Tab-separated table of C-alpha atoms and ligand atoms in Angstrom:
chain	number	residue	atom	x	y	z
A	1	UNK	CA	27.791	86.371	14.337
A	2	UNK	CA	28.545	87.313	18.385
A	3	UNK	CA	24.987	87.655	19.974
A	4	UNK	CA	22.805	85.242	19.935
A	5	UNK	CA	19.176	85.931	19.868
A	6	UNK	CA	16.418	85.773	22.668
A	7	UNK	CA	12.469	84.834	23.970
A	8	UNK	CA	11.302	87.576	25.332
A	9	UNK	CA	7.771	86.729	26.400
A	10	UNK	CA	5.391	89.489	28.084
A	11	UNK	CA	3.427	89.031	30.905
A	12	UNK	CA	0.627	91.653	31.043
A	13	UNK	CA	-0.337	93.143	34.866
A	14	UNK	CA	-3.584	95.188	34.944
A	15	UNK	CA	-4.284	96.874	31.631
A	16	UNK	CA	-0.556	96.393	30.274
A	17	UNK	CA	2.071	94.050	28.514
A	18	UNK	CA	4.904	94.104	30.946
A	19	UNK	CA	8.355	92.495	29.999
A	20	UNK	CA	7.797	88.707	32.775
A	21	UNK	CA	11.596	87.716	33.994
A	22	UNK	CA	14.583	88.115	31.931
A	23	UNK	CA	14.854	86.730	27.550
A	24	UNK	CA	15.702	83.419	27.208
A	25	UNK	CA	17.356	81.125	25.544
A	26	UNK	CA	15.714	80.261	22.017
A	27	UNK	CA	14.764	76.871	21.517
A	28	UNK	CA	15.584	74.633	18.141
A	29	UNK	CA	12.612	74.119	16.101
A	30	UNK	CA	13.955	70.592	14.385
A	31	UNK	CA	14.023	70.006	18.872
A	32	UNK	CA	10.231	70.070	19.273
A	33	UNK	CA	8.621	67.562	16.911
A	34	UNK	CA	4.971	67.434	16.080
A	35	UNK	CA	3.920	64.839	12.866
A	36	UNK	CA	4.678	64.463	10.043
A	37	UNK	CA	4.399	68.138	8.474
A	38	UNK	CA	2.263	69.806	10.996
A	39	UNK	CA	5.431	71.871	11.950
A	40	UNK	CA	6.480	72.484	7.669
A	41	UNK	CA	2.808	73.877	6.569
A	42	UNK	CA	2.597	75.669	10.073
A	43	UNK	CA	6.061	77.566	9.445
A	44	UNK	CA	5.016	77.879	5.741
A	45	UNK	CA	1.790	79.774	7.044
A	46	UNK	CA	3.016	81.989	9.172
A	47	UNK	CA	6.093	83.180	6.427
A	48	UNK	CA	3.478	84.361	3.797
A	49	UNK	CA	1.367	85.917	6.045
A	50	UNK	CA	4.702	87.555	7.585
A	51	UNK	CA	6.676	88.504	4.452
A	52	UNK	CA	2.764	89.277	2.174
A	53	UNK	CA	1.445	92.450	3.732
A	54	UNK	CA	1.019	94.569	0.329
A	55	UNK	CA	-1.790	91.626	-0.377
A	56	UNK	CA	-3.810	92.573	3.350
A	57	UNK	CA	-3.429	96.311	2.517
A	58	UNK	CA	-4.361	96.584	-1.149
A	59	UNK	CA	-7.318	94.938	0.366
A	60	UNK	CA	-8.301	96.625	2.848
A	61	UNK	CA	-8.957	93.312	4.792
A	62	UNK	CA	-7.154	93.183	8.946
A	63	UNK	CA	-4.059	91.899	8.652
A	64	UNK	CA	-4.755	90.104	11.438
A	65	UNK	CA	-4.064	86.154	11.343
A	66	UNK	CA	-4.716	83.319	14.402
A	67	UNK	CA	-3.809	79.814	14.932
A	68	UNK	CA	-5.164	77.151	16.903
A	69	UNK	CA	-3.633	74.813	17.839
A	70	UNK	CA	-6.502	71.912	20.054
A	71	UNK	CA	-5.208	68.062	21.140
A	72	UNK	CA	-4.785	65.903	24.731
A	73	UNK	CA	-2.178	67.793	27.019
A	74	UNK	CA	1.166	67.051	27.252
A	75	UNK	CA	1.679	66.672	23.619
A	76	UNK	CA	4.408	69.598	22.973
A	77	UNK	CA	1.845	72.990	21.967
A	78	UNK	CA	3.388	75.188	24.214
A	79	UNK	CA	6.937	74.222	23.365
A	80	UNK	CA	5.501	74.594	19.723
A	81	UNK	CA	4.911	78.153	20.119
A	82	UNK	CA	8.293	79.196	22.088
A	83	UNK	CA	10.447	77.204	19.256
A	84	UNK	CA	8.374	79.366	15.957
A	85	UNK	CA	8.087	82.789	18.034
A	86	UNK	CA	12.038	82.021	18.169
A	87	UNK	CA	12.680	81.129	15.094
A	88	UNK	CA	10.229	84.170	13.921
A	89	UNK	CA	12.264	86.023	15.959
A	90	UNK	CA	9.086	87.027	18.046
A	91	UNK	CA	8.386	87.515	21.097
A	92	UNK	CA	5.646	86.199	23.573
A	93	UNK	CA	2.980	87.480	24.648
A	94	UNK	CA	1.229	84.688	27.357
A	95	UNK	CA	-1.988	85.327	28.233
A	96	UNK	CA	-3.948	83.109	29.898
A	97	UNK	CA	-6.851	83.475	29.306
A	98	UNK	CA	-8.891	81.289	32.289
A	99	UNK	CA	-8.210	83.990	34.847
A	100	UNK	CA	-11.112	86.027	35.962
A	101	UNK	CA	-8.637	89.036	37.217
A	102	UNK	CA	-9.215	90.180	33.176
A	103	UNK	CA	-12.775	91.025	31.498
A	104	UNK	CA	-13.576	91.570	28.161
A	105	UNK	CA	-12.858	95.410	28.279
A	106	UNK	CA	-9.126	94.444	29.723
A	107	UNK	CA	-9.067	91.602	26.925
A	108	UNK	CA	-9.945	93.909	24.082
A	109	UNK	CA	-7.084	96.800	26.185
A	110	UNK	CA	-4.160	94.500	26.194
A	111	UNK	CA	-4.748	92.169	22.730
A	112	UNK	CA	-4.502	96.295	21.113
A	113	UNK	CA	-1.600	97.536	23.283
A	114	UNK	CA	0.665	93.708	22.457
A	115	UNK	CA	3.610	94.986	21.639
A	116	UNK	CA	5.368	95.033	17.796
A	117	UNK	CA	6.320	92.186	16.406
A	118	UNK	CA	5.227	89.334	18.780
A	119	UNK	CA	3.008	86.724	19.211
A	120	UNK	CA	0.088	86.184	22.530
A	121	UNK	CA	-0.900	82.803	22.825
A	122	UNK	CA	-4.171	82.459	24.868
A	123	UNK	CA	-3.535	79.060	26.962
A	124	UNK	CA	-6.932	77.610	28.038
A	125	UNK	CA	-9.158	78.769	25.705
A	126	UNK	CA	-12.168	75.676	26.368
A	127	UNK	CA	-12.235	76.126	30.193
A	128	UNK	CA	-12.929	81.098	29.906
A	129	UNK	CA	-15.238	79.616	26.913
A	130	UNK	CA	-17.430	77.238	28.390
A	131	UNK	CA	-18.107	80.223	31.459
A	132	UNK	CA	-14.868	89.294	33.488
A	133	UNK	CA	-15.987	85.499	32.784
A	134	UNK	CA	-17.834	85.942	28.788
A	135	UNK	CA	-17.701	83.532	26.290
A	136	UNK	CA	-18.959	86.130	23.202
A	137	UNK	CA	-16.549	88.939	25.254
A	138	UNK	CA	-13.757	86.720	23.670
A	139	UNK	CA	-14.925	86.787	20.227
A	140	UNK	CA	-15.747	90.074	19.969
A	141	UNK	CA	-12.453	91.405	21.578
A	142	UNK	CA	-10.798	89.305	18.803
A	143	UNK	CA	-13.018	91.284	16.411
A	144	UNK	CA	-11.752	94.640	17.669
A	145	UNK	CA	-8.429	96.831	16.550
A	146	UNK	CA	-5.650	94.481	14.798
A	147	UNK	CA	-3.562	96.784	17.046
A	148	UNK	CA	-0.674	98.271	14.417
A	149	UNK	CA	-0.010	95.421	12.434
A	150	UNK	CA	0.588	91.729	12.415
A	151	UNK	CA	-1.486	90.930	15.336
A	152	UNK	CA	0.187	87.049	15.456
A	153	UNK	CA	-2.585	85.234	17.679
A	154	UNK	CA	-2.404	81.937	18.591
A	155	UNK	CA	-4.519	79.673	21.124
A	156	UNK	CA	-4.462	76.468	22.510
A	157	UNK	CA	-7.255	73.797	24.588
A	158	UNK	CA	-7.566	70.497	25.687
A	159	UNK	CA	-10.332	69.374	23.501
A	160	UNK	CA	-12.413	71.746	20.795
A	161	UNK	CA	-15.956	69.990	21.468
A	162	UNK	CA	-16.733	72.450	23.946
A	163	UNK	CA	-15.694	75.612	21.498
A	164	UNK	CA	-18.034	76.095	18.675
A	165	UNK	CA	-17.671	76.595	15.344
A	166	UNK	CA	-18.357	80.205	15.635
A	167	UNK	CA	-14.762	80.151	16.124
A	168	UNK	CA	-12.895	78.833	13.129
A	169	UNK	CA	-13.828	81.858	10.515
A	170	UNK	CA	-12.115	83.599	8.447
A	171	UNK	CA	-10.922	87.293	9.678
A	172	UNK	CA	-10.200	84.608	13.108
A	173	UNK	CA	-9.282	81.471	13.594
A	174	UNK	CA	-7.429	80.768	11.038
A	175	UNK	CA	-5.757	77.390	10.311
A	176	UNK	CA	-6.461	75.001	13.083
A	177	UNK	CA	-4.084	71.656	13.262
A	178	UNK	CA	-4.835	68.766	15.891
A	179	UNK	CA	-1.657	67.733	17.236
A	180	UNK	CA	-2.085	63.835	18.855
A	181	UNK	CA	-0.189	61.082	20.308
A	182	UNK	CA	3.585	60.265	19.307
A	183	UNK	CA	3.447	57.857	16.192
A	184	UNK	CA	6.411	55.608	14.559
A	185	UNK	CA	8.384	59.016	13.011
A	186	UNK	CA	7.642	60.479	16.105
A	187	UNK	CA	9.142	58.400	18.407
A	188	UNK	CA	12.072	57.194	16.790
A	189	UNK	CA	13.478	61.501	15.387
A	190	UNK	CA	13.213	61.443	19.037
A	191	UNK	CA	14.706	58.400	19.921
A	192	UNK	CA	17.710	60.099	17.488
A	193	UNK	CA	17.309	63.364	18.807
A	194	UNK	CA	17.846	62.829	22.663
A	195	UNK	CA	20.475	59.878	22.487
A	196	UNK	CA	22.513	62.473	19.545
A	197	UNK	CA	23.302	59.085	17.347
A	198	UNK	CA	22.818	55.057	17.802
A	199	UNK	CA	21.338	52.322	14.892
A	200	UNK	CA	18.452	54.019	13.332
A	201	UNK	CA	17.098	50.387	13.256
A	202	UNK	CA	17.551	50.078	16.817
A	203	UNK	CA	15.720	53.489	17.037
A	204	UNK	CA	13.028	51.419	15.219
A	205	UNK	CA	12.259	48.352	17.625
A	206	UNK	CA	12.347	51.142	20.523
A	207	UNK	CA	9.507	53.180	18.867
A	208	UNK	CA	7.549	49.570	17.906
A	209	UNK	CA	8.234	48.279	20.812
A	210	UNK	CA	6.098	51.990	22.923
A	211	UNK	CA	3.170	51.978	20.561
A	212	UNK	CA	2.968	48.710	20.871
A	213	UNK	CA	3.690	48.490	24.916
A	214	UNK	CA	0.966	51.784	24.661
A	215	UNK	CA	-1.936	53.223	21.919
A	216	UNK	CA	-2.243	57.139	23.649
A	217	UNK	CA	1.633	57.640	24.811
A	218	UNK	CA	2.558	61.590	25.329
A	219	UNK	CA	5.825	63.035	23.949
A	220	UNK	CA	6.120	64.534	27.686
A	221	UNK	CA	5.729	60.841	28.854
A	222	UNK	CA	8.113	59.834	26.375
A	223	UNK	CA	10.440	62.835	27.577
A	224	UNK	CA	10.136	61.646	31.428
A	225	UNK	CA	11.156	58.001	30.268
A	226	UNK	CA	13.920	59.361	29.133
A	227	UNK	CA	14.900	60.947	31.861
A	228	UNK	CA	14.438	58.350	33.760
A	229	UNK	CA	16.803	56.665	31.321
A	230	UNK	CA	19.838	59.431	30.309
A	231	UNK	CA	23.336	58.918	28.992
A	232	UNK	CA	21.931	55.056	28.565
A	233	UNK	CA	20.173	53.715	25.423
A	234	UNK	CA	20.666	50.081	25.554
A	235	UNK	CA	19.000	50.523	29.029
A	236	UNK	CA	16.168	52.766	28.287
A	237	UNK	CA	15.436	50.336	25.096
A	238	UNK	CA	15.322	46.819	27.294
A	239	UNK	CA	13.805	48.753	29.916
A	240	UNK	CA	10.274	49.874	27.945
A	241	UNK	CA	8.595	45.839	28.311
A	242	UNK	CA	8.945	47.577	31.992
A	243	UNK	CA	6.467	50.918	30.516
B	1	UNK	CA	25.145	124.649	7.941
B	2	UNK	CA	24.328	120.686	9.694
B	3	UNK	CA	22.025	122.074	12.559
B	4	UNK	CA	19.636	122.996	9.297
B	5	UNK	CA	18.067	119.155	7.986
B	6	UNK	CA	18.661	120.032	4.985
B	7	UNK	CA	22.398	118.931	5.396
B	8	UNK	CA	21.182	115.188	5.772
B	9	UNK	CA	19.110	115.420	2.610
B	10	UNK	CA	22.192	117.312	0.532
B	11	UNK	CA	24.151	114.569	1.373
B	12	UNK	CA	21.411	111.636	0.112
B	13	UNK	CA	20.737	113.569	-3.382
B	14	UNK	CA	24.617	113.706	-3.555
B	15	UNK	CA	25.743	109.988	-2.990
B	16	UNK	CA	21.966	109.118	-5.301
B	17	UNK	CA	23.379	110.843	-7.547
B	18	UNK	CA	26.855	110.611	-8.558
B	19	UNK	CA	26.622	107.673	-8.048
B	20	UNK	CA	30.775	106.388	-9.053
B	21	UNK	CA	31.860	108.668	-5.873
B	22	UNK	CA	35.210	107.938	-4.368
B	23	UNK	CA	35.784	109.129	-1.702
B	24	UNK	CA	33.147	108.227	0.675
B	25	UNK	CA	31.803	108.356	4.296
B	26	UNK	CA	29.978	105.932	5.481
B	27	UNK	CA	26.573	106.291	7.905
B	28	UNK	CA	25.181	103.229	10.061
B	29	UNK	CA	21.341	103.068	11.052
B	30	UNK	CA	21.615	100.802	13.881
B	31	UNK	CA	18.392	99.270	15.650
B	32	UNK	CA	17.510	96.549	18.551
B	33	UNK	CA	13.924	96.590	18.903
B	34	UNK	CA	12.231	94.505	21.480
B	35	UNK	CA	12.721	91.284	21.345
B	36	UNK	CA	17.272	92.256	20.556
B	37	UNK	CA	16.123	91.545	16.717
B	38	UNK	CA	19.127	93.942	15.515
B	39	UNK	CA	18.314	96.272	11.791
B	40	UNK	CA	21.180	97.248	10.561
B	41	UNK	CA	21.756	99.400	7.106
B	42	UNK	CA	24.891	101.028	5.549
B	43	UNK	CA	24.578	104.629	4.376
B	44	UNK	CA	26.901	106.144	2.082
B	45	UNK	CA	28.076	109.884	1.999
B	46	UNK	CA	30.018	111.499	0.425
B	47	UNK	CA	33.548	112.118	2.239
B	48	UNK	CA	34.622	115.011	3.883
B	49	UNK	CA	36.793	117.572	0.842
B	50	UNK	CA	35.719	118.885	-2.529
B	51	UNK	CA	33.856	116.922	-4.459
B	52	UNK	CA	33.363	117.894	-7.708
B	53	UNK	CA	29.419	116.826	-9.091
C	1	UNK	CA	-17.448	126.150	21.207
C	2	UNK	CA	-15.989	124.934	17.255
C	3	UNK	CA	-12.493	123.874	18.499
C	4	UNK	CA	-9.923	125.910	17.435
C	5	UNK	CA	-10.057	125.721	13.717
C	6	UNK	CA	-12.288	123.302	11.568
C	7	UNK	CA	-14.246	120.873	14.041
C	8	UNK	CA	-14.742	118.086	11.346
C	9	UNK	CA	-16.857	115.950	13.196
C	10	UNK	CA	-18.587	111.873	11.402
C	11	UNK	CA	-21.413	109.995	12.668
C	12	UNK	CA	-22.634	107.121	12.079
C	13	UNK	CA	-26.424	105.429	12.276
C	14	UNK	CA	-27.152	101.882	11.850
C	15	UNK	CA	-30.745	103.824	11.028
C	16	UNK	CA	-32.220	107.591	10.748
C	17	UNK	CA	-35.877	107.336	11.621
C	18	UNK	CA	-34.155	107.220	15.500
C	19	UNK	CA	-33.359	110.702	14.648
C	20	UNK	CA	-35.332	113.108	14.437
C	21	UNK	CA	-35.129	116.214	11.581
C	22	UNK	CA	-33.720	118.804	13.992
C	23	UNK	CA	-30.368	117.150	13.977
C	24	UNK	CA	-29.995	117.767	9.650
C	25	UNK	CA	-29.895	121.578	9.801
C	26	UNK	CA	-26.654	124.210	8.807
C	27	UNK	CA	-24.906	125.025	11.915
C	28	UNK	CA	-24.542	120.634	12.442
C	29	UNK	CA	-25.362	117.342	10.428
C	30	UNK	CA	-23.911	119.318	6.735
C	31	UNK	CA	-23.933	116.455	4.005
C	32	UNK	CA	-26.305	113.147	5.172
C	33	UNK	CA	-25.596	110.570	2.846
C	34	UNK	CA	-26.886	106.803	2.736
C	35	UNK	CA	-24.627	104.449	2.062
C	36	UNK	CA	-26.645	101.253	1.193
C	37	UNK	CA	-26.200	97.649	-0.212
C	38	UNK	CA	-23.866	96.653	-2.910
C	39	UNK	CA	-24.824	98.111	-6.981
C	40	UNK	CA	-23.482	96.093	-10.057
C	41	UNK	CA	-20.428	98.137	-10.216
C	42	UNK	CA	-19.469	98.057	-6.268
C	43	UNK	CA	-19.582	93.735	-7.176
C	44	UNK	CA	-17.229	94.422	-9.988
C	45	UNK	CA	-15.099	96.879	-8.277
C	46	UNK	CA	-14.701	94.254	-6.078
C	47	UNK	CA	-13.911	90.517	-7.867
C	48	UNK	CA	-11.743	93.885	-9.537
C	49	UNK	CA	-10.139	94.582	-6.620
C	50	UNK	CA	-10.013	91.550	-4.647
C	51	UNK	CA	-8.522	89.282	-7.537
C	52	UNK	CA	-6.648	91.662	-9.240
C	53	UNK	CA	-6.477	90.761	-12.685
C	54	UNK	CA	-8.963	88.692	-14.480
C	55	UNK	CA	-11.884	88.498	-17.718
C	56	UNK	CA	-14.190	91.767	-17.170
C	57	UNK	CA	-17.125	89.634	-18.174
C	58	UNK	CA	-16.183	87.121	-15.283
C	59	UNK	CA	-16.955	90.751	-12.829
C	60	UNK	CA	-19.958	90.848	-14.729
C	61	UNK	CA	-21.561	87.631	-14.385
C	62	UNK	CA	-20.350	86.933	-11.210
C	63	UNK	CA	-22.013	91.145	-10.211
C	64	UNK	CA	-25.750	89.548	-11.675
C	65	UNK	CA	-25.353	86.488	-9.882
C	66	UNK	CA	-25.030	87.542	-6.458
C	67	UNK	CA	-26.926	90.014	-7.603
C	68	UNK	CA	-29.751	87.427	-8.404
C	69	UNK	CA	-28.784	85.062	-5.261
C	70	UNK	CA	-29.213	88.452	-2.308
C	71	UNK	CA	-31.108	91.602	-2.377
C	72	UNK	CA	-29.691	92.745	0.966
C	73	UNK	CA	-25.893	91.159	0.763
C	74	UNK	CA	-23.573	93.549	2.388
C	75	UNK	CA	-19.934	94.348	1.332
C	76	UNK	CA	-18.755	93.030	3.927
C	77	UNK	CA	-20.614	89.988	3.522
C	78	UNK	CA	-18.637	89.483	0.255
C	79	UNK	CA	-15.176	90.193	1.497
C	80	UNK	CA	-16.119	87.436	4.047
C	81	UNK	CA	-16.964	85.039	0.739
C	82	UNK	CA	-13.675	86.507	-0.983
C	83	UNK	CA	-12.221	85.361	2.275
C	84	UNK	CA	-12.949	81.795	1.928
C	85	UNK	CA	-11.407	81.828	-2.219
C	86	UNK	CA	-8.811	83.512	-1.589
C	87	UNK	CA	-6.185	83.987	-4.914
C	88	UNK	CA	-9.338	81.263	-5.687
C	89	UNK	CA	-11.510	83.591	-8.244
C	90	UNK	CA	-13.327	80.536	-10.571
C	91	UNK	CA	-13.707	78.712	-6.794
C	92	UNK	CA	-15.541	81.995	-6.086
C	93	UNK	CA	-17.274	82.794	-9.381
C	94	UNK	CA	-18.312	78.888	-9.527
C	95	UNK	CA	-19.833	78.842	-5.706
C	96	UNK	CA	-21.607	81.953	-5.937
C	97	UNK	CA	-24.647	79.860	-7.313
C	98	UNK	CA	-23.924	78.047	-3.175
C	99	UNK	CA	-24.155	81.054	-1.253
D	1	UNK	CA	9.637	110.101	-0.112
D	2	UNK	CA	11.606	107.201	2.082
D	3	UNK	CA	8.322	108.408	4.823
D	4	UNK	CA	5.221	106.523	4.236
D	5	UNK	CA	2.128	107.987	7.275
D	6	UNK	CA	0.702	107.406	9.269
D	7	UNK	CA	-2.812	107.684	10.596
D	8	UNK	CA	-3.472	108.041	14.636
D	9	UNK	CA	-6.792	107.184	16.186
D	10	UNK	CA	-7.147	109.008	19.365
D	11	UNK	CA	-9.605	107.501	22.299
D	12	UNK	CA	-10.863	109.498	25.363
D	13	UNK	CA	-10.054	108.710	28.291
D	14	UNK	CA	-11.486	110.247	31.384
D	15	UNK	CA	-12.025	113.914	30.425
D	16	UNK	CA	-8.743	113.814	27.321
D	17	UNK	CA	-7.965	112.742	24.706
D	18	UNK	CA	-5.570	109.875	23.724
D	19	UNK	CA	-2.748	107.875	21.729
D	20	UNK	CA	-4.678	104.384	21.226
D	21	UNK	CA	-2.141	101.952	20.215
D	22	UNK	CA	0.561	103.052	17.486
D	23	UNK	CA	0.287	104.929	14.931
D	24	UNK	CA	-1.887	102.578	11.549
D	25	UNK	CA	-1.226	102.875	7.524
D	26	UNK	CA	-3.344	104.034	5.368
D	27	UNK	CA	-6.120	102.208	3.996
D	28	UNK	CA	-5.926	103.327	1.330
D	29	UNK	CA	-9.292	105.902	-0.728
D	30	UNK	CA	-10.212	103.112	-3.488
D	31	UNK	CA	-10.147	100.448	-2.190
D	32	UNK	CA	-13.182	101.427	-0.158
D	33	UNK	CA	-15.809	101.447	-2.849
D	34	UNK	CA	-18.780	103.006	-1.513
D	35	UNK	CA	-21.122	103.974	-4.642
D	36	UNK	CA	-21.160	105.712	-7.911
D	37	UNK	CA	-20.393	109.382	-6.624
D	38	UNK	CA	-20.601	109.251	-3.146
D	39	UNK	CA	-16.891	109.226	-2.273
D	40	UNK	CA	-16.513	111.728	-4.575
D	41	UNK	CA	-19.066	114.016	-3.503
D	42	UNK	CA	-17.518	113.367	-0.171
D	43	UNK	CA	-14.442	114.384	-0.781
D	44	UNK	CA	-15.412	117.191	-3.298
D	45	UNK	CA	-16.882	118.814	-0.236
D	46	UNK	CA	-14.343	117.743	2.670
D	47	UNK	CA	-12.106	119.774	-0.062
D	48	UNK	CA	-14.016	123.226	-0.386
D	49	UNK	CA	-14.492	123.258	3.671
D	50	UNK	CA	-10.831	123.190	4.224
D	51	UNK	CA	-8.685	124.380	1.163
D	52	UNK	CA	-11.813	128.406	1.645
D	53	UNK	CA	-11.188	129.525	5.499
E	301	ADP	N1	6.673	67.388	20.157
E	301	ADP	C1	7.400	67.595	21.243
E	301	ADP	N2	8.594	66.793	20.495
E	301	ADP	C2	9.735	67.212	21.706
E	301	ADP	N3	9.789	67.497	22.840
E	301	ADP	C3	8.170	67.441	23.278
E	301	ADP	C4	7.304	67.520	22.376
E	301	ADP	N4	6.365	67.052	23.389
E	301	ADP	C5	5.899	67.630	24.594
E	301	ADP	N5	7.548	67.347	24.643
E	301	ADP	C6	8.573	67.667	25.832
E	301	ADP	O1	7.674	67.283	26.852
E	301	ADP	C7	8.231	68.401	27.857
E	301	ADP	C8	6.098	68.988	28.352
E	301	ADP	O2	5.226	69.258	27.547
E	301	ADP	P1	4.330	70.948	27.966
E	301	ADP	O3	4.769	71.579	28.554
E	301	ADP	O4	3.295	69.503	28.291
E	301	ADP	O5	4.195	70.502	26.200
E	301	ADP	P2	2.261	71.471	25.692
E	301	ADP	O6	1.625	72.149	27.103
E	301	ADP	O7	2.683	72.357	25.480
E	301	ADP	O8	1.318	70.019	26.040
E	301	ADP	C9	8.494	69.909	27.938
E	301	ADP	O9	9.469	69.944	27.935
E	301	ADP	C10	9.321	68.834	26.087
E	301	ADP	O10	10.238	69.379	25.793
């Protein structure tokens, strides 16, 4: 009980995974609010994948599963990945595939030598997939050796159109989910979280006011607005019309 | 002797066979993997002294 | 040099025509075997393995249906199809005609 | 009985055999179904080659 867990994000230099910085605190999962039940569905799918290794090994299939998250920037994709990795006590292996430093062989070697009990995150997947620079090499490397066990890979893109349907396939990207702009429940839950204890009707009115004012409001913009009126809920509510 | 690997095997066999051993000693397996996942398990072996099986 | 001892070497090719008969010789490639497309027994055993416990007649009907639908079906394609209907044998059987 | 065996695949870099990755779980033989008796024939031939040096 005296020990607080930490999430260690691994970076890759050359062709080896290295500890980037020092261990970081675990962001609570409920802090990142995605949608009505997207977080619950993803957590349940990951729990099923992790807690049932017998199913894959007995049927002679690689114990590898991958998820793709697509949505507008600033919707909380990477934050959700970090929260999930903290919840599962795994470690993050961040890899910016948009960088041209690594090639197909280097990417395959990095994905093969990934640390155990670790989540590999591939951000900006849409960028390099349009264009060392390769698009088929990435999917060929993805279908290579599935690590030691449980090669959970997370890939995030701002848009899914630049990708191809071949990416979404069993043995590859398995459960794609769309995280988008905030909803009424999203806004009221954010207001309840940032300000610990107020009138729920006030939160509902706040959510309705922002929904009326903006249609494509992002949760990052909501957090930035909340930072302006830190420890000031009434002022923020009165200043919604300003936004 | 303790150097031989049959020592631990025999102790484990004894604690598996004679389940009702009133006198016992503990062996805690502690390993902190990467990302700080602490795994612990208590393994019990017969305590030093004389035991009858 | 044949290593220290028991230098068991395995070599795999998509086709044997591009090779030469000199490769197949004692002191060299010893037992060549041809692994090809699935058969009735192959398909029914795969169905029994992937789904742990169903009607054997259902597995036989599944195997016959895939044999009728495709002639050069590969076991990798069979596994990929089974992944589409994981934990869903009845749906997979009803969806054989889709394949 | 408490130990599960693993298969270690070796890769070659330069002119030396190196341990590629970490040890992997043993896929059951019956999981891979080849044909009527091809697996049995290959297993028997390998057993004869190994057990009669
Ligand atoms: N759904 C959400 N719930 C809570 N906070 C969020 C959410 N989305 C974004 N944020 C906040 O916005 C800030 C910026 O997030 P950002 O790095 O843009 O996420 P991403 O890059 O995954 O879109 C973060 O500090 C995060 O706390």
